Each structure stands twice: as C-alpha cells, then as structure tokens.
mmCIF file of C-alpha atoms in Angstrom:
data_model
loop_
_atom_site.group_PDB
_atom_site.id
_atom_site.type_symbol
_atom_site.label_atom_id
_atom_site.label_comp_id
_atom_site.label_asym_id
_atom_site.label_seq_id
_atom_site.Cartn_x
_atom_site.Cartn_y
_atom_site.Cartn_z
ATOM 1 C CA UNK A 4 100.156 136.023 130.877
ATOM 2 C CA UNK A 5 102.892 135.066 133.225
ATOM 3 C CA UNK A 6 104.866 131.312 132.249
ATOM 4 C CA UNK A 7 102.972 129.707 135.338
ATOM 5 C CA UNK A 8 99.763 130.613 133.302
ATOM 6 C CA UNK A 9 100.918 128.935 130.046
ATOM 7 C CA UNK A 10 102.208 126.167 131.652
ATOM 8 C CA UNK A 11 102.286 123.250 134.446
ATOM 9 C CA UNK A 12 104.410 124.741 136.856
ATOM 10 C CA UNK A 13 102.677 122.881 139.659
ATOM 11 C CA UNK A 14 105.913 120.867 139.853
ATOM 12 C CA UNK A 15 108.389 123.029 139.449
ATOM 13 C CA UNK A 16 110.368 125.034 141.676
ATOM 14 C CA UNK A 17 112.894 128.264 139.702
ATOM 15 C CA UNK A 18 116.081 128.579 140.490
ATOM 16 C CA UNK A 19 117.465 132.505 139.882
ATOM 17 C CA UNK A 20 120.605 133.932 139.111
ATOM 18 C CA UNK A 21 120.162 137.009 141.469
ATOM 19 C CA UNK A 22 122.702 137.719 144.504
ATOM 20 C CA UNK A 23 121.228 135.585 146.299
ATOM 21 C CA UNK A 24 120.174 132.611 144.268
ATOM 22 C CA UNK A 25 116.529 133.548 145.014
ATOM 23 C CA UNK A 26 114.042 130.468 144.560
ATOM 24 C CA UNK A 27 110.526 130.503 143.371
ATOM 25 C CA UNK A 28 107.804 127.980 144.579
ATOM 26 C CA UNK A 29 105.778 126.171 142.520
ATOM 27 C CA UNK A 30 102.693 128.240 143.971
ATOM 28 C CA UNK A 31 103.943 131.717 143.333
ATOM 29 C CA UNK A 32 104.853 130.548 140.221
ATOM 30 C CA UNK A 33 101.468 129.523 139.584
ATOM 31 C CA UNK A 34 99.711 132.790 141.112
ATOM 32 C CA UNK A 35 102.081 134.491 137.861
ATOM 33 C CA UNK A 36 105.771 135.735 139.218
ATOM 34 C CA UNK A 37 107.499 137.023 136.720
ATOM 35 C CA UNK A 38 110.478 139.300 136.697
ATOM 36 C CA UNK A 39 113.591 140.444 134.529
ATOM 37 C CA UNK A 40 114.861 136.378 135.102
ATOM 38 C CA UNK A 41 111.854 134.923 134.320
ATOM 39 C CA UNK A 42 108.875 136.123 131.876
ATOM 40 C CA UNK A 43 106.592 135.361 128.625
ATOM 41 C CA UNK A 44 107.524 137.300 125.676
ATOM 42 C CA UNK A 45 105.418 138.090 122.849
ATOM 43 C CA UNK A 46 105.798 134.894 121.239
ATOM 44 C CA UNK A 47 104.014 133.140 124.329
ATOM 45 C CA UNK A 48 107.857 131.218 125.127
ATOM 46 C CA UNK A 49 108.246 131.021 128.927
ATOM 47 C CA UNK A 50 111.839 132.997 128.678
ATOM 48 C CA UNK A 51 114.931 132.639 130.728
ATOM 49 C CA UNK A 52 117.479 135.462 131.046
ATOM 50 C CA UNK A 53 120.492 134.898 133.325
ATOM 51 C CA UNK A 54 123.536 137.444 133.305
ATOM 52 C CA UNK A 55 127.140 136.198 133.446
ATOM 53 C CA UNK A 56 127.604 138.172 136.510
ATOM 54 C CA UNK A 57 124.847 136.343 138.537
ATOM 55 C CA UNK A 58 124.559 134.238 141.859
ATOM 56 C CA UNK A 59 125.564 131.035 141.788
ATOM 57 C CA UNK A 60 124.505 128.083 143.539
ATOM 58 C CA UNK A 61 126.421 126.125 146.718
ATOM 59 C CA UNK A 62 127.861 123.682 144.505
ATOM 60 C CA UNK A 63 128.351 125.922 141.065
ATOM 61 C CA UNK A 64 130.074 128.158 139.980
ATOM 62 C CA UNK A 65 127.615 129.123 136.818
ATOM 63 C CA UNK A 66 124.695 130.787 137.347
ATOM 64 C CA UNK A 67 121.293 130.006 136.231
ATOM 65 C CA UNK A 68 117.986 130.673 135.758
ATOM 66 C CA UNK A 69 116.303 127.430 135.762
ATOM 67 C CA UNK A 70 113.762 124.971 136.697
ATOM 68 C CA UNK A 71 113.663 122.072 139.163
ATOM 69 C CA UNK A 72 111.562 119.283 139.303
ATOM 70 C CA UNK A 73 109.778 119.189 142.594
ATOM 71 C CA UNK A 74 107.721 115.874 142.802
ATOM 72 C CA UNK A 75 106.334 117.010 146.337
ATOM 73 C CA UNK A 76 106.290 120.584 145.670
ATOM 74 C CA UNK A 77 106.590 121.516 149.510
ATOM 75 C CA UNK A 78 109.716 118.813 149.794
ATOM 76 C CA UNK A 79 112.727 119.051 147.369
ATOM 77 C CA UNK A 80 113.996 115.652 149.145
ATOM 78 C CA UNK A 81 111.101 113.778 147.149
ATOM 79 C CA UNK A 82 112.640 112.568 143.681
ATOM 80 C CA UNK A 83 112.248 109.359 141.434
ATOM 81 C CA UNK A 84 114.767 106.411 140.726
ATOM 82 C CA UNK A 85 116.747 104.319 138.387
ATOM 83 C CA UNK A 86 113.609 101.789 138.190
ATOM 84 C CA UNK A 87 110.734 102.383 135.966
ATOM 85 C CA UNK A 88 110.440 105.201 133.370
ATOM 86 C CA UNK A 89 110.931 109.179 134.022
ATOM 87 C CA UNK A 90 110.316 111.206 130.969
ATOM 88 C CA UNK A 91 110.389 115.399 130.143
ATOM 89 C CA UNK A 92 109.702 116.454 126.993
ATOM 90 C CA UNK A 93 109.909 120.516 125.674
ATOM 91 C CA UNK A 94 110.488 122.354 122.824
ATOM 92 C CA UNK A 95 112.338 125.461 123.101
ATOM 93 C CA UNK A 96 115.318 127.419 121.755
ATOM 94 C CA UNK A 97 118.260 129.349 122.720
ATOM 95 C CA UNK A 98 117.695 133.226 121.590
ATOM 96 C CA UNK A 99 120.800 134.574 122.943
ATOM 97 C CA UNK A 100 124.541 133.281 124.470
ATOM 98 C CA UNK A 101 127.154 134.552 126.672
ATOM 99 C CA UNK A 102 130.567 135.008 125.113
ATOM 100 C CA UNK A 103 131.538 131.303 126.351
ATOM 101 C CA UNK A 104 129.023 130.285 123.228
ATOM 102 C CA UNK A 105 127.906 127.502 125.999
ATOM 103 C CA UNK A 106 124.522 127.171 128.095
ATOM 104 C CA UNK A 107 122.941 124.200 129.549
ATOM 105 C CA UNK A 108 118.745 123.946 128.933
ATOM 106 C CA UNK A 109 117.888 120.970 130.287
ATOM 107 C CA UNK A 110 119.519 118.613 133.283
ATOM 108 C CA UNK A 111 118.824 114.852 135.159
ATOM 109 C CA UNK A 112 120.388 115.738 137.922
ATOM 110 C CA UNK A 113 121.577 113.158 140.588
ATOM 111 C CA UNK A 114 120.867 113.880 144.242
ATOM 112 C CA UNK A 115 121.296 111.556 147.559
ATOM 113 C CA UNK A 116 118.573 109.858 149.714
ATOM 114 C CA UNK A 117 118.673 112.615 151.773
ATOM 115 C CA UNK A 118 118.256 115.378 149.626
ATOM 116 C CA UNK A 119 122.659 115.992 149.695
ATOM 117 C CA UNK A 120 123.564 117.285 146.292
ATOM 118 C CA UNK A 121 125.365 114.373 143.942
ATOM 119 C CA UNK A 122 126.512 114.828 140.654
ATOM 120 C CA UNK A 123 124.450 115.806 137.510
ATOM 121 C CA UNK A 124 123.602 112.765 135.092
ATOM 122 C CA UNK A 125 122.168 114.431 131.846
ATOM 123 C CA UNK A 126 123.451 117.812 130.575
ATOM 124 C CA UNK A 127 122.141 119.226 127.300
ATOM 125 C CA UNK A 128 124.755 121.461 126.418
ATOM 126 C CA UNK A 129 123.939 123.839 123.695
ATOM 127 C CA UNK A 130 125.909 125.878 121.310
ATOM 128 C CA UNK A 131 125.725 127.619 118.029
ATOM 129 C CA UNK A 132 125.341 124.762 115.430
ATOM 130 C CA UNK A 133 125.525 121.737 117.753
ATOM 131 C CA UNK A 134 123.750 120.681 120.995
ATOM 132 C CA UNK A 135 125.548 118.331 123.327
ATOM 133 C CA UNK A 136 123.304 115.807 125.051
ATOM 134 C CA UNK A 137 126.213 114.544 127.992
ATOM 135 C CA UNK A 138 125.496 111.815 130.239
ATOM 136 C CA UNK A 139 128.091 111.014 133.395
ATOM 137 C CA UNK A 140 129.985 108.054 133.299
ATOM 138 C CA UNK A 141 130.093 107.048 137.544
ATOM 139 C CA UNK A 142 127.927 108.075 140.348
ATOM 140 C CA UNK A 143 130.747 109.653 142.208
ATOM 141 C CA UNK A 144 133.923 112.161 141.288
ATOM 142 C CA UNK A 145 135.495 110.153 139.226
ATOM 143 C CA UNK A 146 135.121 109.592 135.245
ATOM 144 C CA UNK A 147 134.398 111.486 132.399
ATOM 145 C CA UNK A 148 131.239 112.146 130.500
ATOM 146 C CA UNK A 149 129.898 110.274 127.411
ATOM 147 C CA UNK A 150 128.852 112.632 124.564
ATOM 148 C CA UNK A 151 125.980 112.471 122.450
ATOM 149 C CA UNK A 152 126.279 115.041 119.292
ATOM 150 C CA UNK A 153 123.798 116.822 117.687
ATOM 151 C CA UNK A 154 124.199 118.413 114.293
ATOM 152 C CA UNK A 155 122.573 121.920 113.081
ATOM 153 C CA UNK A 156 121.134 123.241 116.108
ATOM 154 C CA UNK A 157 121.784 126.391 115.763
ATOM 155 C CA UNK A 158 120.638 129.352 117.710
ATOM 156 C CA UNK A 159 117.017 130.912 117.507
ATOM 157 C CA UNK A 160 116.145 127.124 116.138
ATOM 158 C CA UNK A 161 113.300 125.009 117.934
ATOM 159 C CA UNK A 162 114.387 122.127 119.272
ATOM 160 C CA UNK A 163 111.804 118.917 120.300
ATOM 161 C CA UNK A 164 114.020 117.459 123.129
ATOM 162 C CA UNK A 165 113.164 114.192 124.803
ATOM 163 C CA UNK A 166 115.224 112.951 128.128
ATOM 164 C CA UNK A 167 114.325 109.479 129.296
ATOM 165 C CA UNK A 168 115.163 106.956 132.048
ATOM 166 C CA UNK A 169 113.867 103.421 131.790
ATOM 167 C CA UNK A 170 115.302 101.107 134.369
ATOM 168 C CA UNK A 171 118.908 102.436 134.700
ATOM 169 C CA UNK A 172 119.490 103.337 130.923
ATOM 170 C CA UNK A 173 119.024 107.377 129.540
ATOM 171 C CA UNK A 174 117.779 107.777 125.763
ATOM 172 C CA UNK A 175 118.519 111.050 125.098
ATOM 173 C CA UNK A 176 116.528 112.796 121.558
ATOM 174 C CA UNK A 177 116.711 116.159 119.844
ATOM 175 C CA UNK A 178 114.274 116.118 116.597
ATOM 176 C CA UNK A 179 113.489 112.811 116.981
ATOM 177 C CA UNK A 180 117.166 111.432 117.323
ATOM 178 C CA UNK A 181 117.583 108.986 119.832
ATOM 179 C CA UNK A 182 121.112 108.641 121.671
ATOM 180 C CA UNK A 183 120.976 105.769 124.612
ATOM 181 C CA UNK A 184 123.678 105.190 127.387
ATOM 182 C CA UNK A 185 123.572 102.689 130.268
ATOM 183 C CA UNK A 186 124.434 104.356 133.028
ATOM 184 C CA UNK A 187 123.535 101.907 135.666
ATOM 185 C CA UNK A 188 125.138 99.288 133.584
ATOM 186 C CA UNK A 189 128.784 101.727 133.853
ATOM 187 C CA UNK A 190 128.476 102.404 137.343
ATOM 188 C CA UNK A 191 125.785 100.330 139.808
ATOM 189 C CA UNK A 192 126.486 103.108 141.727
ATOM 190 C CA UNK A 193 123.589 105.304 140.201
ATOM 191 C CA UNK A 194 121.645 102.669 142.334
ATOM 192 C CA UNK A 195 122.552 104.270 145.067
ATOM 193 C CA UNK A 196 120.737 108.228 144.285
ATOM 194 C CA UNK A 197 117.595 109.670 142.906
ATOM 195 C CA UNK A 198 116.846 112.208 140.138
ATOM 196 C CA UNK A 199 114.955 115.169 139.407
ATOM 197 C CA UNK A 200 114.434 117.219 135.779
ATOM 198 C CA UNK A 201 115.964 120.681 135.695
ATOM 199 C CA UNK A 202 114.740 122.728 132.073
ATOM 200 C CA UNK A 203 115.846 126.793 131.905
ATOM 201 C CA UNK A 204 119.314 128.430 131.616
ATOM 202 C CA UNK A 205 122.006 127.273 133.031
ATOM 203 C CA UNK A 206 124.676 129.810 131.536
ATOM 204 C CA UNK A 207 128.869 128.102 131.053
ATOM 205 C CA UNK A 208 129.990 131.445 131.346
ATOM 206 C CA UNK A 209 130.929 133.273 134.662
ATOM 207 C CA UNK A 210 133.221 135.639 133.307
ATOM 208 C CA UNK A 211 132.798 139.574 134.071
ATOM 209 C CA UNK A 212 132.227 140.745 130.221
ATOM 210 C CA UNK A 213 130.601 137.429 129.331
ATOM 211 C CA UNK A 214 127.268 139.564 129.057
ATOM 212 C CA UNK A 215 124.124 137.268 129.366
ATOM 213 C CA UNK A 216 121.968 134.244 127.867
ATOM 214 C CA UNK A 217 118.271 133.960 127.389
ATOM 215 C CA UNK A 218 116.471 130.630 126.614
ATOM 216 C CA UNK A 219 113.306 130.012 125.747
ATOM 217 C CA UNK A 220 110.630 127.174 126.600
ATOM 218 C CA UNK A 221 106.978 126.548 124.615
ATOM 219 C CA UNK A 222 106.276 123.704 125.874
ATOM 220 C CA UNK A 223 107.761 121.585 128.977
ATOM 221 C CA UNK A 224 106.345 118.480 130.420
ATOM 222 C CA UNK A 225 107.164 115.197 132.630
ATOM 223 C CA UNK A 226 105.729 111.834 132.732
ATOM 224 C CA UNK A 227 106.321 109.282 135.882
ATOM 225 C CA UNK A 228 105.391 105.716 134.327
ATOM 226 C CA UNK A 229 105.630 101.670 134.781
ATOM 227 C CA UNK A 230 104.791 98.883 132.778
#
C-alpha cells in the first residue's frame, strides 16, 4: 500500500524534489500518492528518492524529498514553541547516497510568527559510518553549529532516532544515545520563533553527476506534551 496507508500522514505535508518543488497535502497523501519521489517498497519502508539534479526550495539550494510537520494541516503558519515538550521518533535508514556521501533525514526547523522562513535548529546529518545530529548555535545568521557524533551508522543500518524539545533545551538520540544542547540558554533569541519536524531526504549534494539518494522510514511519529 501507498506510505499514507502505513502510516500517520495526517500531519504531514511532502516536500518534492521535482522542477517545481511540487508539495503534497496531508489528504492526498492519505488517499495513497505515491510516485518515483515517494513510495513503499517491498520491505513496507515509506521510501524517499531525490536526484541531485532536482528542484530546490526558495531558501535552498539542496533538494529534497521530505516531510513537514503540519500541526493544522490546511495552515503551514501553525507550529509549536520553545515551552513544553515536542517529540518525533522513527526508525529508518539510508539505502543509497549521492556522491557528496551527505543527506539530511530528519530536521527542527525554525520558522517566524508569521510563517517567514528562519533558520533550521536540528539537522541529522548522515553519512557512511557516522550520523551527525547538529543543533544551531543563535536564532539568526550568525554562529556556528554544535555537533553531536554518532559512531557506526553506517548505510543500509536501522537507526531508532529520537529529537526532543523540552522548554528551550534539544536532546538529540540515535540507538538510545542521548546528546542535549541548550539552545535557548545560547541564544534567547529562539524565544522569538516556532518549530516544526521535517523526516525524508534532504540530499547535500547539488552537483550535476552527484546521481541520487534514497532514504527510508518504518516508522515516524510526533508527540505534543506538558507536564
């Protein structure tokens, strides 16, 4: 069956890597799209296939195949804050890279009041032997990122990933390793925006021979909490 038939999708939006940076709602995702970006293979994983070559996004220069959290799923301006706890949990793998080596499979990303773009916070960053779990320093264009290193992920292994905000601070797991940075507590700034979950394939390559990536998701779900 179509992902949207193994899986919540009812809060979820997909992003594609076509020409035209094509997006999916949450509804036609549930009624079963699927496509050469965006299908179930024989294993049941809800698979993510992006070319090098693909669309990319206003504010990217990467292209993607990938989902976005969509709280309201008729308003992409509705998205959760610092305060409280915000949780997505998957498992998944990465079947295949570009030449870069480098894909991104799960995201917080930032976003204004108003539904501007604003920077990512969270960027799990996987390669070959080592996933990268990177959270953003300041709110704005300035800074670095802090890196959080995981050892022996290699490619065509399952990862059990965990992304978490309580009240201003990201814990940030692969297999059950916990990572933590304060990212309120670096920059009050992050005050000031909201967040939404992005899970797929976000492919680091844009190159002409860079060839493609594929991802793959068996199990994806968020949790909005209190006390």
């Amino acid at each position: 069956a179509a992902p949207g038939k193994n899986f919540d999708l009812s809060h979820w939006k997909l992003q594609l890597p076509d020409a035209n940076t094509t997006e999916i709602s949450s509804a036609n995702l549930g009624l079963g799209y699927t496509s050469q970006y965006f299908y179930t293979d024989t294993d049941g994983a809800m698979t993510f296939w992006a070319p090098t070559t693909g669309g990319t996004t206003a504010n990217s220069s990467y292209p993607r195949s990938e989902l976005r959290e969509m709280l309201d799923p008729s308003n992409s301006k509705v998205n959760w804050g610092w305060q409280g706890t915000h949780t997505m949990k998957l498992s998944g793998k990465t079947v295949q890279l570009p030449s870069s080596g480098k894909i991104i499979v799960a995201q917080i990303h930032g976003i204004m009041d108003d539904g501007t773009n604003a920077p990512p916070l969270v960027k799990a960053v996987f390669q070959d032997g080592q996933l990268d779990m990177q959270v953003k320093q300041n709110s704005d264009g300035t800074g670095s990122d802090v890196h959080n290193y995981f050892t022996g992920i290699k490619l065509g292994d399952l990862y059990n990933m965990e992304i978490r905000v309580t009240d201003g601070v990201a814990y940030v797991t692969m297999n059950g390793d916990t990572r933590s940075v304060d990212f309120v507590g670096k920059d009050a700034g992050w005050k000031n925006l909201k967040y939404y979950f992005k899970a797929g394939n976000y492919v680091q390559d844009n190159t002409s021979t860079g060839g493609s990536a594929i991802a793959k998701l068996y199990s994806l779900s968020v949790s909005h909490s209190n006390l």
